[PDB]
């Protein structure tokens, strides 16, 4: 097949910026590209085709251009409407292939930093022969976390479950991460830790065998 | 103007068969190449099959090769994938697209997308675990766990509706073995622990599930 190399995979840009998305084919497929916009939940989107015409409607803000086998989609002052997700693809051969996506976001001027809230395992699991841990997330924009899970001090690789977030009501954003162990070895540590990195800042919560 | 309308998505096991429509308005089937394209949650869009109905003549991509049916019914100005031998990976949501016409090979209108997933865990209810918590005179967080359940959607109220403030259930996790987990929490008045009640009921329809579950701290 023809690969579509897209880049960069996301960027958080501001109302007013000229944003370029750059698309490169791994052969000559002449002018045969088109740029699609897709919003969650929407179908993309037609915003340009043949590389650089205009599709019928669509805002003149929006160009596109070709260089050899480089293709670029040029926003020359974003508006509001246009922070979405944006794919190239080729049309020259069969089958068509897409790139592999632009998330544009909106930047949080004033970002939101989460709450955590984190739980040691049930009785009723413990009983069982057991554990879960809950760490649970909430009320943070932008809508990128990454959780780390400690025994005592030292990081735990296995049994890590973290949901993708998913943007509350409030278009905030919310996710739960969750460790699986034995009994024996909630027991056998003195705490467990939940950290939560947003923006490069870390947000802790211990839970102990108590 | 122009229009595509899908039907036909649904849960299915690895092996089964779905049918997919694609009812077209406003222009002519004839006219023009019907797409099928698949997007895999979280994922980028692929291309699944082609047919132009004027001469029925159609193409795949190898990963279908075999398995999928692209056909068109222009009486009905209606396009259709058959899918059978259906695999995991096959889950996504499915649109349909047409090129523009004549030269006109990008996709000009698509339509709103049906999702398909493949899946061969069975269903299962949750079990439910209480989460149990302390700021004298500040708040308190007390939950529950909704562990191992299949498939979506399972339903949480707390003392049967009653309590709303300070209520936050969050999406579940799909887990590794094919099944969900969630939970649910309330952040409570810490006066109020060991005396008001507080019951989450938790509500799983496909196994006909229903479970009140007491938080004491």
């Known amino acids: 097949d023809i690969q579509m190399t897209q880049s960069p995979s996301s960027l958080s840009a501001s109302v007013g910026d000229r944003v370029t998305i750059t698309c490169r084919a791994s052969?000559?497929?002449?002018?045969?590209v088109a740029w699609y916009q897709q919003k969650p939940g929407k179908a993309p989107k037609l915003l340009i085709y043949?590389?650089?015409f205009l599709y019928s409607g669509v805002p003149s803000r929006f160009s596109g251009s070709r260089s050899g086998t480089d293709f670029t989609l040029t926003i020359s002052s974003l508006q509001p409407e246009d922070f979405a997700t944006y794919y190239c693809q080729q049309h020259y051969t069969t089958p068509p292939t897409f790139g592999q996506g632009t998330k544009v976001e909106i930047k949080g001027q004033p970002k939101a930093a989460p709450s955590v809230r984190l739980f040691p395992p049930c009785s009723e699991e413990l009983q069982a022969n057991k554990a879960t841990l809950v760490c649970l997330i909430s009320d943070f924009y932008p809508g990128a976390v990454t959780v780390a899970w400690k025994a005592d001090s030292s990081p735990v690789k296995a049994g890590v479950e973290t949901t993708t977030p998913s943007k509350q009501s409030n278009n905030k954003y919310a996710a739960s991460s969750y460790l699986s162990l034995t009994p024996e070895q909630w027991k056998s540590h003195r705490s467990y830790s939940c950290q939560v990195t947003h923006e490069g800042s870390t947000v802790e919560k211990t839970v102990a065998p108590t | 103007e122009v229009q595509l309308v899908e039907s036909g998505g649904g849960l299915v096991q690895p092996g089964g068969s779905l049918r997919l429509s694609c009812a077209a308005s406003?222009?002519?089937?004839?006219?023009?190449?019907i797409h099928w394209v698949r997007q895999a949650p979280g994922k980028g869009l692929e291309w699944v099959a082609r047919?132009?109905?004027?001469?029925?003549?159609?193409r795949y991509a190898d990963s279908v090769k075999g398995r999928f049916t692209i056909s068109a019914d222009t009486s009905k100005n209606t396009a259709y994938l058959q899918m059978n031998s259906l695999r995991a990976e096959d889950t996504a949501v499915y649109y349909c697209?047409?090129?523009?016409?004549?030269?006109?090979?990008?996709?000009?209108?698509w339509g709103q997308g049906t999702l398909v997933t493949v899946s061969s865990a069975s269903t299962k209810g949750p079990s439910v675990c209480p989460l149990a918590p302390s700021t004298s005179g500040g708040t308190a967080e007390l939950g529950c766990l909704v562990k191992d359940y299949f498939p979506e959607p399972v339903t949480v109220s707390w003392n049967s509706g009653a309590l709303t403030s300070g209520v936050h259930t969050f999406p579940a996790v799909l887990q590794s073995s094919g099944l969900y987990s969630l939970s649910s929490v309330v952040t409570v008045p810490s006066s109020s622990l060991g005396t008001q009640t507080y019951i989450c009921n938790v509500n799983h329809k496909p196994s006909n599930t229903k479970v009140d579950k007491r938080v004491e701290p």
């Open positions: 043949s590389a650089s």
């Open positions: 047919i132009y109905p004027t001469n029925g003549y159609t």
């Open positions: 697209s047409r090129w523009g016409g004549d030269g006109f090979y990008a996709m000009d209108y």
């Open positions: 052969q000559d497929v002449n002018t045969a």
């Open positions: 406003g222009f002519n089937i004839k006219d023009t190449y």
